[PDB]
Amino acid sequence: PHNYLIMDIEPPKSVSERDILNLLSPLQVKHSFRVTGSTRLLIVIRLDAQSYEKLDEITVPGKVEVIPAVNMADTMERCGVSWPRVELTDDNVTLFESESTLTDVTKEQLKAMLIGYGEHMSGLLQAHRFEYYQAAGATPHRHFVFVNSVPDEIEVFGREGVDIWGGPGEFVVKPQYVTRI
Amino acid sequence: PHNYLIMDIEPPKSVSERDILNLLSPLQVKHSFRVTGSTRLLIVIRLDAQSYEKLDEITVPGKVEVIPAVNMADTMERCGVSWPRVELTDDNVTLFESESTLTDVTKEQLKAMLIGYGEHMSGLLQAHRFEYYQAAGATPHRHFVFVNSVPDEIEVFGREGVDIWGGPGEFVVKPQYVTRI
Amino acid sequence: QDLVFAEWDKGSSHEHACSALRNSSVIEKGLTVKEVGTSKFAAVLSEPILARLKFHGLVEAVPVVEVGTVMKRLNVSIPPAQDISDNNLTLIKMSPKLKGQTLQQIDAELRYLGEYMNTVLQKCSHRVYISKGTFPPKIYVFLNMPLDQIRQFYPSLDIFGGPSSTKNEISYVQILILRN
Amino acid sequence: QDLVFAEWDKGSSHEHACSALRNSSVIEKGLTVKEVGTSKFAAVLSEPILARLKFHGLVEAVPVVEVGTVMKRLNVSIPPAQDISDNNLTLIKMSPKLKGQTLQQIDAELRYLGEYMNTVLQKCSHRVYISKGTFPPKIYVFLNMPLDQIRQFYPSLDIFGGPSSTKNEISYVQILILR
Amino acid sequence: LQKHYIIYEVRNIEKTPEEVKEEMKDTDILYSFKALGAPSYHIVVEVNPRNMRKLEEVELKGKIRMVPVVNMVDVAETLGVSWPRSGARLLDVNLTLIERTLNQEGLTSQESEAHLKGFMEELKDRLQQYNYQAFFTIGASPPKMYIYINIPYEEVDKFACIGINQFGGPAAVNTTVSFISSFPK
Amino acid sequence: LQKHYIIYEVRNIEKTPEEVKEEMKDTDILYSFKALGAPSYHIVVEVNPRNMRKLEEVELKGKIRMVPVVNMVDVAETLGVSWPRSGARLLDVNLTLIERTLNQEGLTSQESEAHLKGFMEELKDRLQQYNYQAFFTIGASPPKMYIYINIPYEEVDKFACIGINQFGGPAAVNTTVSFISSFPK
Amino acid sequence: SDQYTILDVYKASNVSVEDYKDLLKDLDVVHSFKVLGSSRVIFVVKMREDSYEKLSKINLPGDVYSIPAGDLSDKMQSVGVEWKRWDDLPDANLTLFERTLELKGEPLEGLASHMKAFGEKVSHVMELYPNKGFYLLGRTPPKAFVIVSLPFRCRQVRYGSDFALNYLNGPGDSSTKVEFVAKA
Amino acid sequence: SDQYTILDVYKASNVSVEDYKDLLKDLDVVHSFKVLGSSRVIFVVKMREDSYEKLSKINLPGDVYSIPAGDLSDKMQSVGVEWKRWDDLPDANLTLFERTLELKGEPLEGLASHMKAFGEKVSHVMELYPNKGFYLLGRTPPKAFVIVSLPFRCRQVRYGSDFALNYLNGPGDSSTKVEFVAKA
Amino acid sequence: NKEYLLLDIRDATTSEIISALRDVEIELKVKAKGIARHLIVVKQNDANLQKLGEIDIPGRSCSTPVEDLDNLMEDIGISWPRNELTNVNVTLFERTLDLKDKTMEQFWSEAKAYGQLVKPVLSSFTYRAFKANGAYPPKVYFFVNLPRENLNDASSKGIDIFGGPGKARTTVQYVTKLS
Amino acid sequence: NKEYLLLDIRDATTSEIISALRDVEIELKVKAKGIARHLIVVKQNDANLQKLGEIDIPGRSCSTPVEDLDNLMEDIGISWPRNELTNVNVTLFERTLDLKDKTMEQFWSEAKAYGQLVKPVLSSFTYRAFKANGAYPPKVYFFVNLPRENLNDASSKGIDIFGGPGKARTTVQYVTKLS
Ligand SMILES: *[C@@H]1O[C@H](CO)[C@@H](O[C@@H]2O[C@H](CO)[C@@H](O)[C@H](O)[C@H]2NC(C)=O)[C@H](O[C@@H]2O[C@@H](C)[C@@H](O)[C@@H](O)[C@@H]2O)[C@H]1NC(C)=O
Ligand SMILES: *[C@@H]1O[C@H](CO)[C@@H](O[C@@H]2O[C@H](CO)[C@@H](O)[C@H](O)[C@H]2NC(C)=O)[C@H](O)[C@H]1NC(C)=O
Ligand SMILES: *[C@@H]1O[C@H](CO)[C@@H](O[C@@H]2O[C@H](CO)[C@@H](O)[C@H](O)[C@H]2NC(C)=O)[C@H](O)[C@H]1NC(C)=O
Ligand SMILES: *[C@@H]1O[C@H](CO)[C@@H](O[C@@H]2O[C@H](CO)[C@@H](O)[C@H](O)[C@H]2NC(C)=O)[C@H](O)[C@H]1NC(C)=O
Numbered sequence A, B: 001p002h003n004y005l006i007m008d009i010e011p012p013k014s015v016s017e018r019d020i021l022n023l024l025s026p027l028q029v030k031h032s033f034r035v036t037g038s039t040r041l042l043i044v045i046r047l048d049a050q051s052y053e054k055l056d057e058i059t060v061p062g063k064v065e066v067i068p069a070v071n072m073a074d075t076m077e078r079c080g081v082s083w084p085r086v087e088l089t090d091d092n093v094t095l096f097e098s099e100s101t102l103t104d105v106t107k108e109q110l111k112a113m114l115i116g117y118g119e120h121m122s123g124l125l126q127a128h129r130f131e132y133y134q135a136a137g138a139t140p141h142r143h144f145v146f147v148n149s150v151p152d153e154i155e156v157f158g159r160e161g162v163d164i165w166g167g168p169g170e171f172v173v174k175p176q177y178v179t180r181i
Numbered sequence C: 001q002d003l004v005f006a007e008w009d010k011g012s013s014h015e016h017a018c019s020a021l022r023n024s025s026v027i028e029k030g031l032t033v034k035e036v037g038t039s040k041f042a043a044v045l046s047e048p049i050l051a052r053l054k055f056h057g058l059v060e061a062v063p064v065v066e067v068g069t070v071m072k073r074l075n076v077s078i079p080p081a082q083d084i085s086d087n088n089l090t091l092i093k094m095s096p097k098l099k100g101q102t103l104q105q106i107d108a109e110l111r112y113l114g115e116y117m118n119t120v121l122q123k124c125s126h127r128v129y130i131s132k133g134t135f136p137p138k139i140y141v142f143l144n145m146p147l148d149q150i151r152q153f154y155p156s157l158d159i160f161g162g163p164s165s166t167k168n169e170i171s172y173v174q175i176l177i178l179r180n
Numbered sequence D: 001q002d003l004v005f006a007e008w009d010k011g012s013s014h015e016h017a018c019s020a021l022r023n024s025s026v027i028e029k030g031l032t033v034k035e036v037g038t039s040k041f042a043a044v045l046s047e048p049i050l051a052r053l054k055f056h057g058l059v060e061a062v063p064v065v066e067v068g069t070v071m072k073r074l075n076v077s078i079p080p081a082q083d084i085s086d087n088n089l090t091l092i093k094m095s096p097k098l099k100g101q102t103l104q105q106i107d108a109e110l111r112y113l114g115e116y117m118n119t120v121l122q123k124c125s126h127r128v129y130i131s132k133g134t135f136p137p138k139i140y141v142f143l144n145m146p147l148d149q150i151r152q153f154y155p156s157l158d159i160f161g162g163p164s165s166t167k168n169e170i171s172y173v174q175i176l177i178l179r
Numbered sequence E, F: 001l002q003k004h005y006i007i008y009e010v011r012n013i014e015k016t017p018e019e020v021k022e023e024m025k026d027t028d029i030l031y032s033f034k035a036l037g038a039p040s041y042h043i044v045v046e047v048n049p050r051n052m053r054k055l056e057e058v059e060l061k062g063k064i065r066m067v068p069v070v071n072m073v074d075v076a077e078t079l080g081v082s083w084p085r086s087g088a089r090l091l092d093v094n095l096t097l098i099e100r101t102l103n104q105e106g107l108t109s110q111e112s113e114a115h116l117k118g119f120m121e122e123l124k125d126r127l128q129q130y131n132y133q134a135f136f137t138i139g140a141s142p143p144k145m146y147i148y149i150n151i152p153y154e155e156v157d158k159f160a161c162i163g164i165n166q167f168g169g170p171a172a173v174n175t176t177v178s179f180i181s182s183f184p185k
Numbered sequence G, H: 001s002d003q004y005t006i007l008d009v010y011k012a013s014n015v016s017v018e019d020y021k022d023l024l025k026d027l028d029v030v031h032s033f034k035v036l037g038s039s040r041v042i043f044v045v046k047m048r049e050d051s052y053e054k055l056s057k058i059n060l061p062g063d064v065y066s067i068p069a070g071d072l073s074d075k076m077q078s079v080g081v082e083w084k085r086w087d088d089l090p091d092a093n094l095t096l097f098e099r100t101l102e103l104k105g106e107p108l109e110g111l112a113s114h115m116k117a118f119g120e121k122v123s124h125v126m127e128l129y130p131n132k133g134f135y136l137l138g139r140t141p142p143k144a145f146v147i148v149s150l151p152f153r154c155r156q157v158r159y160g161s162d163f164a165l166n167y168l169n170g171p172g173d174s175s176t177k178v179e180f181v182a183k184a
Numbered sequence I, J: 001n002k003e004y005l006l007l008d009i010r011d012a013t014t015s016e017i018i019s020a021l022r023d024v025e026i027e028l029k030v031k032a033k034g035i036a037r038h039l040i041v042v043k044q045n046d047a048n049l050q051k052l053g054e055i056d057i058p059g060r061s062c063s064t065p066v067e068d069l070d071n072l073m074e075d076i077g078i079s080w081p082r083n084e085l086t087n088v089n090v091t092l093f094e095r096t097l098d099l100k101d102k103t104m105e106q107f108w109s110e111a112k113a114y115g116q117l118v119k120p121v122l123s124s125f126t127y128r129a130f131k132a133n134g135a136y137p138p139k140v141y142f143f144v145n146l147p148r149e150n151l152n153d154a155s156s157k158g159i160d161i162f163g164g165p166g167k168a169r170t171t172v173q174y175v176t177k178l179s
């Protein structure tokens, strides 16, 4: 099971996608995306020992958030849910950022809801190429979903298992069109 | 549209199914049921002018609740929802008592939920003989359903539309087997 | 099926027909218990058998189904263990207050509770019944378990939201009729 | 479809490239508006058109769908959309809080809101967009209603649970490109 | 070996205290208390095979609540607290019953255990100078605690409010005080 | 003949007040206020075809919040409450700005209207002694109220808390007081 | 300082107030109020050292509740509020207020602060009219019984119930029940 | 009672505390605190008849907030709490507490009762250590800035933030922020 | 002025209740249709209270001091029509209000708003309303003469003023006026 | 005893911060990986606070008095191990608690429960914990040397003691310990 680092970057006006030279050259960059219509960037980095050591000579300018992450398929497999393990295609991609907003929830209740969401999505993930990244160690629960962009499928994918998490008022889902590199 | 009176009777130990004699000759009793396994009685009376006037000299003993009621199919028709118009005839019947226990709800929000519930149930009520009685003028919303007792269908009828009313915690449903008397 | 969990309270009446609950020719293929030292009686009976009784003080009559059926409907396997006996027989009534919860959320919580009880109650005779079409749902568990271990079931309440999201009643019962 | 409602705020930048939002060669199809007197800009554009702009200070980019097709999917009538103009042009951003609500409950409330706005907005030129796959959902209304009647949309908030179960933002906007 | 008990809360306005006592047949009774001047009774019975067999002939009448309980020193041992040794005999002089029901709304099991441990650490020192018997519900939710204590009446009020904040304050607990004596007289 | 206004709340730490005023080009300004010694500005503009045409050339920089408002006198007339006539000119002496944002959580529209009517009836009598101008957001939720008042500085603390209970108490309302003056000097 | 037992009695059939007073003739019954229009009667028994044994030998017929209680003026003095203590009640215009406090989410100190403020606000009115107050000992939610003689009683009932209620967190954080009583 | 203006300044680049103090030399700056470890500086200006006209002509660079304020001891005196008034603050161990009260669901009377009880509880330690207190005028949620010289500092900061918090309804409905300040 | 006392009697017959209360001045008396339930509103004066102190009410009785809602509305400045109650279609609405996190000011402003809202509609109905005097939660007994098809309308008129149908618990009962 | 002051500095390089904070006694300095963010914990001496009053910290700095969580646990009778933090897998957990509807006693009993729960767990880890001194809502900075596979395990340890994952907000950041 791999460990990852998700960089959400809002660079200064002066810096123009030279962040790739800062990052891609010494690090193992798994994915590079730009939020369509903006200058915000989202970088998925695989944290091997070399990349982790090299990160301490790197400073990304701007408003940057760095989220340790895991492949949520690994978590589902550990919890007994089987998900397809298929690499994400170079086709156009939609990103869903999801966060739990419930204030009254137990650890066991949260695990039950997570397992239920995994079981519910298991059937509908067979016809798609996707990657789930859960923010490791972050509470409340938070994850990012990179899924192949199918027209007239954003509403279906976002509105799926929302009721398992507590309903439309207790689960924040933000779909975003992203452009590779 | 007809007005109704629902008499929920828990008679004293000495009195036993002489309650029928009390209501029999004077009142237009549309339905008479006994909760199976107990002495509790549920009477549905059509409130015509003669029956309303006759109720003056009738006193049902015991712990008795009298609920003014309307046919909820009439309410749905007033709101634009088309429900099947059937006469409950089968001698085997299940009764569902439903009440809303939602404290934060507006009048228009409640009307939206009621219309949504009616539209949701319109499809599933086609293959059924049923009668809805809504407690007229009572808040929060409260109704009774008499439906054909098909075993292995109690769960389906009980849980249909619960999420429209706000979920399993905001809606109270009580099913009971009733024997026609 | 058509199982009903019925509970009667005959504290008010000093004479009653609840001796029928010990009458094997009235109760067939059912279960009847009496709360120890109390005028409270309970039974799980098929609807035709329940139709034979007209007891006065009925606390409740909830259509229920055996957990095995519920677990099979969710493709979850729970062995039926052994049959309950009269030694250490305890009735647990669990009523979750699913405030601010959805139907899918309670379904997921119920599946998780089933998975947890699968291993927790694997070595004790029990009978689990779940209400049908009743909201909020009710669970009845006849557990025949060592009294010291009763407190170990406390953390299960966490699955539905914590100790005060769930009303929990514990009682000691005596078997009168147990027929299959 | 692939419509996106995008909002940018250029207050920080003295010189920016948002003049492209007034350029027909860039915005081949879609709608662009500017908040009156400020440097906030909004647009409703197809995703390929949105890919042409690379602006700083993007407040949001929400995949949206016209209310006509949402009503068609719900089999609910939608008054034919009259084309908006520049006079009286108002943008209303509606963000319901659905605390405690279920998906079927919010769907029923949305159906009721559509049915209620059917009669209210029968005469006013308008353009309604609803978010896709976004929770909590967002509604964007472009209106040409007289200002005196703006206070009359308040009871609609009652459909979602009252005035404080919904966050409402009113703005005066000017049309730049409408194709 | 842990001891388990049943507390019968009896409300019977139609029987004399002698008849209520006779309703228990030959069951061995640990305590039998009656509220002063009121038809409210508490019968505390130890759970063992002999008592369980004798209770088969008992059918209490009236408004009855049956509560399985454990001794509070057992709860103390499980939580790591050491409560003072309870007294075997509860005399009629200054005898008082304090009942607490904890709301516990919005908490988890671990959080509730932490609160209970805090309350018990607070009450441990004050309990030292009194002759008491305390019981806690086993499995019931909301939980209930019973204290039968020989305490001077002028100190009852404050003593009943000790450690209330450990459970969230007065709105989070239901506290009831009764003057009791052994029955029948 | 109801009048509609826009209040621009401008936060700009880089421009001089003269530059901020010049940012508005040739639109007609009704009131232009600046917090004492702070880079916060309030610009009140009357909505009419001429001003709307002039505002097309205006692009305010910094943190800007455009808020459409109506006069609180019109709100009074629609709620059946009378409002002390507002003074035409607001002087720099004793000039204060009181801003209120109402939470309204858990209420319906009719309930909120009842509370607003109660607040306005309470404030009517005390408002009679002062030169003031008041505005209310039109359509915004949560609603906001602005009062520009020439009031002695010793009285502003009590005047700002008048009618708070009409909205549910202090925790249900965000109230802000500022000393303001017309700009540029 | 002094402890009391409130015997709240719903009179059994064929049992009159005189019968109940006869059953308690050996106890120090300081007050006895009968609720007009119902079968409820309240006996306040001043407890002595031998009062508890005597009360333990007495079984009153009907639905009876025995509630330990203390003087409300003593409790008000303990929180630093000065309350006039009346020797006796005027036998006319007597009105009983039962108030239960439900201060959700407050610690004991917050409830004490609310009660101190309310007592300070209401002490002047309490000084105006003869009254006797009792509170339930160690009881949560806190509960008080106050019998006050009210001229203008009909509107004074609403005025007294509503008086300084915001100091108790408003009309929703407490429950009040009013009865018309007569000396028994 | 006197009115004040608190100028909360986040200093621009290349501008020192002395530059800001020279921009305000014509005003009655009674107190001037710089936050240690940051660029924040707080100026307290005692307002007079001409102070408002003078302040309207001053533009301070950086992120400036101008908040009307009153003396906290006056506010405590109005609710009937006696608070020792210190003429001067020591130059050492100066700690700044900013407290915001967020007692949800309470009327103004309930908040006043909570604050009166808290003030009575805290007046004893307030009389022990030199301190200056200010509260924001007409501001909800109510907010206070208190600068106090604490010996035994880095444990008294926790002790003083925790002191009598239950009288303000516990640690869940008031926010406290602590800074180490020096006289500017 | 002097308000009233309501007696709610359950397990007694009309003849027994009339036999007792023989010297008591009765403002109003009704019997729930089909039910052993009687409501007797008696005037609160010295003679009535003295007589009530000496009689035993048959059955199970609960007494509640009540104030005529017309008088309270007039006290707060709202003038209700005061139409005399008739013996036709006598219907009792019992409403309890849930005030949670409300101040006294909000309670009074809501009461004023409701009174103003229903003042013009009561001119077409005969009624008699009583409020539990000094009781919290607030409780109102509202007797109306109205068609049985209006029960849902009458109960829902102004329900939003007090917070909506989830915050006001209403029960309806048909009664007979006992002359 | 004396505790520390934490400077959270953004938009400044390590050289600038080291040069500016020259002559200041520093207890612990770290830099977030890939980020212009530094955490500097300095001792609260008279000399340190005197020096901090004469220097300008580069970038945007936020100061916070902090107390060593070991000493706080020692106050309430819990003896944590004091394994010195190393520079191998330095991970910063930032946790904020939500204490709505809690008393001071509940807060302290929960803190004690958490301390006793994790006391034996910390014996196998190196760490350094600081609590925002006197701040509400409570905030904790926890530096741990742990494998990157244990993050979810470390965050959820005893999360139910304070009310579950919905009441505690946690962020995780990899840092480099500067020497
Ligand atoms: C029952 O409660 C009594 C108070 O209601 C106790 O009397 C109190 O005894 C104190 C110690 O002797 C004495 O200082 C107090 O003044 C006195 N309180 C009064 C008179 O109001 C009584 O305990 C008595 O004293 C103890 C030490 C034993 O000797 C008992 O046998 C005495 O009666 C309490 N009695 C018991 C048995 O607990
Ligand atoms: C009924 O439960 C009781 C109480 O837990 C059991 O008695 C205890 O059993 C445990 C092991 O399960 C022993 O450690 C204890 O010493 C036992 N206590 C006593 C007093 O015997 C009892 O075994 C159970 N009985 C049956 C028949 O299952
Ligand atoms: C633009 O909006 C204005 C402001 O509401 C409209 O003018 C008002 O129209 C209403 C009727 O809707 C009249 O009662 C008012 O007297 C008008 N106010 C004036 C003329 O100052 C105006 O009609 C709108 N113009 C459009 C929609 O083209
Ligand atoms: C008493 O109630 C009856 C029954 O509801 C009323 O008669 C109805 O009146 C409505 C209009 O008010 C008509 O639409 C119905 O057709 C009538 N129903 C019947 C069965 O005749 C009657 O008007 C009411 N009388 C009074 C004085 O309120």
Ligand SMILES: *[C@@H]1O[C@H](CO)[C@@H](O[C@@H]2O[C@H](CO)[C@@H](O)[C@H](O)[C@H]2NC(C)=O)[C@H](O)[C@H]1NC(C)=O
Residues within 6 Å of the ligand: A049, J088, J089, J145, J146, J147, J148, J149
């Ligand atoms: C520092 O982190 C690394 C990377 O996670 C740890 O090495 C891993 O250790 C786990 C078990 O602890 C093994 O399952 C992995 O295979 C290891 N990964 C590699 C790449 O070797 C390392 O142990 C950590 N060191 C410390 C001191 O905590």
Ligand SMILES: CCCCCCCC/C=C\CCCCCCCCCCCC(=O)O
Residues within 6 Å of the ligand: G097, G099, G100, G101, G125, G126, G135, G136, G142, G143, G144, G146, G148, G156, G159, G160, G161, G163
């Ligand atoms: C155990 C603590 C319980 C405390 C609850 C509150 C107790 C306060 C005391 C009495 C409660 C209700 C009393 C109000 C009636 C008192 C007389 C007031 C008459 C008012 C006359 C007027 O308004 O002029």
Ligand SMILES: CCCCCCCC/C=C\CCCCCCCCCCCC(=O)O
Residues within 6 Å of the ligand: H075, H097, H098, H099, H100, H101, H115, H125, H126, H135, H136, H142, H143, H144, H145, H146, H148, H150, H156, H159, H160, H161, H163
């Ligand atoms: C109207 C504004 C209301 C805001 C609340 C005002 C309350 C006071 C504000 C802040 C004070 C919090 C800290 C008090 C200063 C510390 C005093 C105690 C120091 C030592 C205590 C001890 O040693 O125990």
Ligand SMILES: CCCCCCCC/C=C\CCCCCCCCCCCC(=O)O
Residues within 6 Å of the ligand: I093, I094, I095, I111, I114, I118, I121, I122, I125, I131, I138, I140, I142, I144, I146, I150, I153, I154, I155, I157, I170
């Ligand atoms: C302090 C409380 C203030 C008043 C409480 C509100 C009392 C309402 C109680 C019950 C409601 C039934 C009301 C009676 C009918 C109201 C007027 C008729 C309204 C429309 C009737 C119709 O349309 O037929």
